[model samples]
Target chain A: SFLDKLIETKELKNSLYNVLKHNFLYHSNKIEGSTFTTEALALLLDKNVVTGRHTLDDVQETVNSSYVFDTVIDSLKEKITHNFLRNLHSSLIFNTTLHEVEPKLDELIEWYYSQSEVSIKVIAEFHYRFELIHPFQDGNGRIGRFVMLKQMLENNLPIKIVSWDSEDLYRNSLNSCSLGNYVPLIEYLSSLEDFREVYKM
Target chain B: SFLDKLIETKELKNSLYNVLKHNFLYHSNKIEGSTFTTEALALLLDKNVVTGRHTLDDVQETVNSSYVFDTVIDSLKEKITHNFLRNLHSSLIFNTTLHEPKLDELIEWYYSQSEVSIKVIAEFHYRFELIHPFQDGNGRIGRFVMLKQMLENNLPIKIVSWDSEDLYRNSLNSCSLGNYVPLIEYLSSLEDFREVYKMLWKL
Candidate 1:
């Protein structure tokens, strides 16, 4: 209850950070197939870039700083899409310019880029593309979802990506990119119940 | 932009407070008759609850605290709801037992109950009987509409009365007392939403 009271006051920061700190201590094992680690870490550490090297302390520092969260995420658009390709090439050399196809991302990103004339699907397509780029070296899956939130927020949809069924497919779809096809991945994440509810918030 | 940023940190406190304040302000002028006081206040503030509320401040807060928003809400369940009805009926006079089928009263209490970061509006299609603490107007209609609006906003459904909607209304219809199991269940379910992603952090 006191924790809840703390969240209500801006002088102390938010309550969710407190929740994560407690949970992490109880569940110290490396999370398998869980994006919580990445998101929690990114918010907690203020790392600007989500990566494996960062630990729980980083998460604590970042989430506590109301200043850093805004500053770092401002560039995720360019960074994730670009870094994805660079990481792919470094890991196992690519013949063509992957960045061109993915295109450099910008501030006004969208979730449904394909249906429109905007040269990209933006939804599953951008998500899939970001993975192929393999941005951030590690925490790609987690950060990619975070970036998706940015795109959704821009589109006036505050969709929280908490679908259990889609999480596995999202990861599998990225793994499927070596084949140059990603429809299954796109459709899997899109089929959630009233996905637009996040925006309505 | 500066003003936008200012509202996020400093002005947000009195900002929402002003919503009720200005409405009462306009009402004090005796300008009643479906006068758009709330909308007018929103226009003056120039900030929609969602978009305007989103700022570096909020993001940082969200990041720092996972389910802090929901937790604070969940945490206040007992205290908030209890105080709500208590305050609403603190003073009553006359036999106000005749039920008025208006739902906004309860809706208004829920929103104004606390100064949380979220705003809820419920809309429903049904008749709700009000339970009068004394011997007057059943709060059923008001309570029903409050739940209705909450559902419309994808929030939880809750009530302070038990029994079926019809049965509950009958108690009000007959001006008798009744239980509120339905509302209790609503509050129970809502507690999860209020507590999602919540974990405590110390030092």
Candidate 2:
């Protein structure tokens, strides 16, 4: 009841933000997914480009992590859509994306580009197919989230990439995992602290 | 625009408040509809038993208002659904809600939001009045919903009740035609509406 009050009043909006801080980073993939999200978030901010400065080491991490991602993906090279689906956990969209059409991503974008109409339905279908396609070498789900944000802005929809179903997927996975290790998630999120500075009031 | 900016920063929430202050009361029906709505609002507050006892004068207003409403409806006897549908228009819902079966669907959409952004809110307002579930009190109910939505989102908004009968009628016409911009623009324009109302003493 108190929690409902907090939500109703939105008094704990900042506190909720703190929880989701770890929620997104912890749930998406690894610290890289989290850090890349905050760092590489530059491209996604639609009208008012997100203003921030980054340290040299942050750049290094972005690159370092990309290589690490390549190494990670190298291992998954022979894998099919199954692995991608397993990794298809949502980020806090609305708060935060979707996937598939792996090899046909070029064709998919062609279709996506030519279409002038933008609505939730179009975005929904695009996201659905995006997950099945698993377009990128890795983090298809993560990139998918960002792409949807772009789509929402283009459509003039409020940029509410707040995720819902992904939380369910994570809950189901974590339920079975039942108190599995989350130290790595916190470790990765905090790891960016030195490289990335937080803006505070 | 001042309106859009006000919405974004929620800067003019108080001004928005003044607008809805009457928007709810004025638009629900006639002045009596407005008066009864303000009085009956006590039952709906959920918490806080609204105090400040009604005076003999207030009681008479309530009685007078109810009597007026009965006479107002008494003249419309034998009317079918078409008259009701023509009368349907959105109040500042979300800034304030109903129907029955359709209302349940709207409520499902309302409470079920992880997607309850402003865009969805506009859609909700459209659907509620479009459904026109009740013959009477549709505007008031919709405005009540508008109140819940604004409070929920932490943005205090004010919507001046339909400024004029002609304006209100045309806006609903645009909404049913599937273009929401006119209605949204009307909503945003409330803060700028400093004009007085033409009291509906004539039916």
Candidate 3:
């Protein structure tokens, strides 16, 4: 209910947008070893000025990821498709090495529609499959997380990102998932929090 | 999805529709002590013929409930509101004598948010029973409304059968005393989820 009220206030909308954009891009990029802090991403996003000592690709990566999220949110109504994933991968990483990604995603989308309910297991399995594909040369983790957030939004659930307190746990979990033991990865992924906490909501 | 394909074929749509219509109404009415057999109810629904000996009120109950289900499916996109509940109640009972239902409050509580859990739908079922909006057919109508909510939420649309287990009826009453544990447990444990999904696949 308060969400409707917040939507009507343009100032609040802008502030929330900035907070979420910075928080999401910061952690997502950080996972891939980007050295830009959240503050630098905010300046780059809100003012088009990178206020930190960062490389050009670092700033461009953040910008491209922000644009990809915006597009995902806008097309939330469309059915999740292999074409959508391929196009989104192209937009985010500018790579067309996606022929193998579509068939796997087709089976994934079909499995998604065949279910009677949504659960942590369903989302975790989806994330696991998407990660196994590794659709892009780089930014696969960030784009995969973005797809997870998009699915959560489509289901009217709160957006949850993969924020790890330790890189060791994250790396170990992802590596363990390759051996067909999803317990560690599922447990780690399900423990993430929403962006509201970043804005102190 | 196959739903889009099934919609384009009239024969497939009609076949699936008949199965669901008969299955849903039969079990729903049987739970509430209706003496109409499934075959007879099918005749009543498909051909408007009361095949067996039955009271006029019993026949009317079946007819009214079928109409109510049809309306609920038709209005799946409409926001649940006081007017919709009142109109549905009138259609189910063929009268406007319902009173003190407080359906506006129930609608707001259930539909004020964009997302709801299966638990919320179960609680709504309990609350709707407590309201007993119509003089007759409240049980069938309540179950129908629950199915509507399930369908709208992309849930498996299964009719809760109160006849299979004594605990089913017992839990409904236990919930009436303001303790929802039994009712919630019963609703959560329904076995017809697979059947509902099977029907959806046909559509």
Candidate 4:
């Protein structure tokens, strides 16, 4: 129990943030149709090494996802602000290409605050509302998931890492959420146990 | 339709407030062991009127519940403030009697304009009573605050009838201590939300 043998900063990132950073980038982007392998993704995150990426778009987005995830993990304690959310969107999808586009973020988030609903269902419903708000065309899915992750963390719920296989569930649940029914998605999110268990320790 | 009709107003309270006024006070006080009948409670509300063998404690809280409920219905658009909640607790237990650090924190979280189902209201009710900040009338104050949150959320004004006392007891402890589904479902049934959806949907 006395392995106070502490990990160095490099060793720490390589171990925890490295897994979190690598896998989150891998799965979230892959859900949106990225084609990079875990080896290339891991290599890219560990050392800015972008070897054998199949497409320019994949490499840029792969790198962008890592940056956005870092921002999500870092901003956990602060209340979410529009500028904060927009920065995550812009960082992930900017030179990559939005405007008054952001004020909608302002509006939606303000709306979330006033609602009397505090259930995880609020997060489920918000992700759909964000999709409908559609502030950016390219990176909304990843950004939306980051917002979800941020809220789940704020509530002390396990950070939901939507798995590679839940693609259809994600899409269909998202579609159902659009109709003003959140139970399916709420039920879906309630079951996200294995991901945090796998890497959070 | 559901949104506008459910908004509480001073005018609306006088008009829509009667049945809810008599019954909610009747039942919430009863749950805490008050013995006034509906007619007795209504009679009391009708001078602010009392003619009863009912214990003085029941009668004092009966009159006080009316004032607290009116204060709540009037303050629907206002953010819940510690001052206001203190006033509510003081009035309900006036016949009776903070611990304000925990209450200050709850009010801050309330304004943090955060998280729902009955979950927000239910969670608030739990946290407030858990602080048991008041020496008396914690449950009564919790129910009044729940009404305030409910009306703000456009819920049908509810009167938790005496018939469900045991159910409410179980739901309160169960929801407060942990799993909220029992409480949420209990709250949902009380509102009969299907009727709202039915009316709203027909449009």
**Cα lDDT of all candidates, in order?**
0.35, 0.41, 0.67, 0.68
- Can you rank all candidates by lDDT, best first? 4, 3, 2, 1
For each candidate, what TM-score against the reference?
A: 0.27, 0.27, 0.44, 0.43
Model 2 deviation from the true structure expressed as Cα RMSD, one decimal place: 22.7
lDDT per residue, candidate 4, A1-201, as tens digits?
A: 101211133266566556656776787888988876788677667755544423434555666788788778767667777677778877886333131667776777887788764557788888888888887666778988888877766665555677677448877877776456778788778877745566545
Candidate 1: residue A34 lDDT (0-100): 29
Clashes of each: 48, 38, 0, 8
State model 3's lDDT. 0.67
Could you give candidate 1's per-residue lDDT for residues A42-146 as a string of tens digits?
A: 443332333223223333233322222233234334433445433432332211122132433432233344344322235566677665655454445544554
Q: After superposition, how far is residue A93 of candidate 1 from its true place, in Å?
A: 24
Candidate closest to the true structure, highest lDDT: 4
Decoy 4 TM-score against native: 0.43
How much of the true contact map at the interface does candidate 1 reproduce, as a fraction? 0.00
Query: What does the lDDT come to for candidate 2?
Result: 0.41
Q: Model 3: per-residue lDDT, tens digit, A79-193?
A: 7776777677777763112317778777888988788886666777787887887666776688778777777666656556676457566667777775356787778766776
C-alpha lDDT (0 to 100) for residue A133 of candidate 4: 81
Off by over 4 Å in 2: A1-201, B1-99, B162-165, B192-203
Candidate 2 TM-score to native: 0.27
